[PDB]
Amino acid sequence: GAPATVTEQGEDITSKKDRGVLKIVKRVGNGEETPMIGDKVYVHYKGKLSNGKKFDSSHDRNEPFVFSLGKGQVIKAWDIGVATMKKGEIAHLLIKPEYAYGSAGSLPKIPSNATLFFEIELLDFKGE
Numbered sequence: 001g002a003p004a005t006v007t008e009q010g011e012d013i014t015s016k017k018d019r020g021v022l023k024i025v026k027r028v029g030n031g032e033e034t035p036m037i038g039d040k041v042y043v044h045y046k047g048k049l050s051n052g053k054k055f056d057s058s059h060d061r062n063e064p065f066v067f068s069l070g071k072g073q074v075i076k077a078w079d080i081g082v083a084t085m086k087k088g089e090i091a092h093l094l095i096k097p098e099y100a101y102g103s104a105g106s107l108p109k110i111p112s113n114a115t116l117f118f119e120i121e122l123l124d125f126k127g128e
């Protein structure tokens, strides 16, 4: 599956180089411009546990998912990963618990120490 592919061939985009967030670009975006901290960000995504046991999509709710980058309205991995993307890019992320929900998890949706997979499309970003 996609999660294994990202383990095999994904780029480690962490500062600490701890393989806690791994990325493959699956479709290239446009521009050199990528979002700065505080940017308003628009994505479609689909997510699961790497176990495959719970699943989640923006599509499910009709409309795009919208958040302020680097304001921890998301897990740290998204702040990190999204910030590396271009308008129009789709990428795959594999995330260790430390850049997601940690040893406390987030029951019942997320268990302790969970690895997460996401597919993310970056639709747009506007400045605060």
Ligand SMILES: COc1cc2cc(c1OC)OCCCOC/C=C/CCOC(=O)[C@@H]1CCCCN1C(=O)[C@H]2C1CCCCC1
Residues within 6 Å of the ligand: 045, 047, 048, 049, 054, 055, 056, 073, 074, 075, 078, 106, 109, 110, 116
């Ligand atoms: C742990 O809680 C949830 C996690 C996730 C989805 C959830 C959660 O219930 C609140 O509900 C469906 C979407 C509600 O949307 C606004 C909330 C974002 C919560 C913060 O979530 C995150 O930061 C990340 C990244 C942005 C998309 C949502 N994501 C999740 O981890 C998903 C999760 C993905 C893996 C399968 C289970 C759901």
